[PDB]
């Protein structure tokens, strides 16, 4: 493991605390900023949709990536959530209502069984449709890095079509130089706002796995824009987006 202390520049630019892990599969390099935070547990927020999609697909609750769960009629603060959405659309716009219904149909005993089997974080469930948002369930950046690595190499106890379907919906950005896959997360822990971006970038068929985790107590901070600028600056400094990796 290589401590990359110079990456603090991109966390001090926005006055947030954070950590970044980057595992280059081809080179075998493992670069981490803020190693102590990499071992700390936080609520997963919307990054749990990766796990929720796998279980939903594996148990048959979600037929495929086009499966539609209609809008429950409750107007919410995100306009993109107020529509009948397929699983692929809901995953990419991070539509919590869709996956709350998915968790309800999976039911808590089955959900608990898959958490103990995979050993996902602290494996704790509060309520069936809130436990990934209410700080009951927690998982460390290190544990999420190992999870998405196992997902990429079909090393999870799911069927290969299940895992293939989840990898495909994660594809967010495709250029001739690279392909970028991730799931974002944003949750609250008391006065703190926690931000996640977890996924991988592929250039010339070589994957590099990454987990970004930051926090701020500034209520005014545009977490959505900040997490993405920090990610792009970290990957640019690491030499990505040119097709040379």
Structure description:
The protein is of the alpha+beta class. The chain has one domain: Beta-lactamase (3-Layer(aba) Sandwich). It is built from 9 helices and 9 strands. A hairpin with a 2-residue loop joins strand 8 and strand 9. Helix 3 packs across helix 5. The longest helix has 15 residues. The radius of gyration is 17 Å and the shape is globular.
Approximate shape: globular
- Rounded to an integer in angstroms, the radius of gyration calculated over CA atoms is 17 Å
CATH top level is Alpha Beta
Order of helical and strand elements: EHEEHHEEHHHHHEEEEH
Give me the CATH superfamily.
DD-peptidase/beta-lactamase superfamily
What's the number of domains?
A: 1
The helix-and-strand class reads: alpha+beta
What topology, given as strand order, has the largest sheet?
Answer: 1-3-2-9-8-7-6
Span of the ends, CA to CA: 19 Å
**Biggest β-sheet, characterized?**
7 strands, mixed
Second CATH tier, the architecture:
3-Layer(aba) Sandwich
CATH topology: Beta-lactamase
Determine the number of helices (DSSP H or I, runs of at least 4 residues).
Answer: 9
PDB class: hydrolase
Keywords: beta lactamase class D, serial crystallography, Structural Genomics, Center for Structural Genomics of Infectious Diseases, hydrolase
Assembly: monomeric
Entry title: Crystal Structure of the Beta Lactamase Class D from Chitinophaga pinensis by Serial Crystallography
């Amino acid at each position: 493991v290589e401590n990359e202390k110079s990456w603090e520049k991109y966390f001090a630019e926005y006055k947030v605390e954070g950590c970044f892990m980057l595992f280059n599969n081809s080179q075998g390099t493992f670069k981490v900023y803020n190693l102590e935070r990499s071992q700390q547990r936080f609520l997963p927020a919307s990054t749990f949709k990766i796990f929720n999609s796998l279980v939903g697909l594996e148990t048959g609750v979600i037929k495929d990536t086009s499966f539609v769960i209609p809008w429950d009629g409750v107007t919410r603060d995100m306009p993109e959530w107020n529509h009948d959405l397929s699983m692929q659309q809901a995953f990419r716009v991070s539509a919590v209502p869709y996956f709350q219904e998915v968790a309800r149909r999976i039911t808590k005993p089955v959900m608990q069984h898959w958490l103990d089997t995979v050993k996902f974080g602290n494996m704790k469930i509060s309520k069936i449709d809130t436990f990934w948002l209410d700080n009951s369930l927690q998982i460390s950046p290190d544990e999420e890095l190992g999870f998405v690595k196992k997902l990429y190499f079909d090393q999870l106890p799911f069927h290969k079509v299940t895992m293939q379907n989840v990898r495909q919906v994660m594809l967010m950005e495709k250029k001739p130089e690279y392909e970028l896959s991730y799931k974002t997360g944003m949750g609250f822990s008391g006065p703190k706002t926690i931000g996640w971006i977890t996924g991988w970038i592929e250039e010339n068929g070589h994957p590099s796995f990454f987990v970004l985790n930051i926090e701020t107590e500034n209520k005014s901070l545009d977490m959505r824009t900040v997490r993405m600028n920090i990610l792009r600056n970290l990957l640019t400094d690491a030499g990505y987006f040119k097709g040379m990796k």
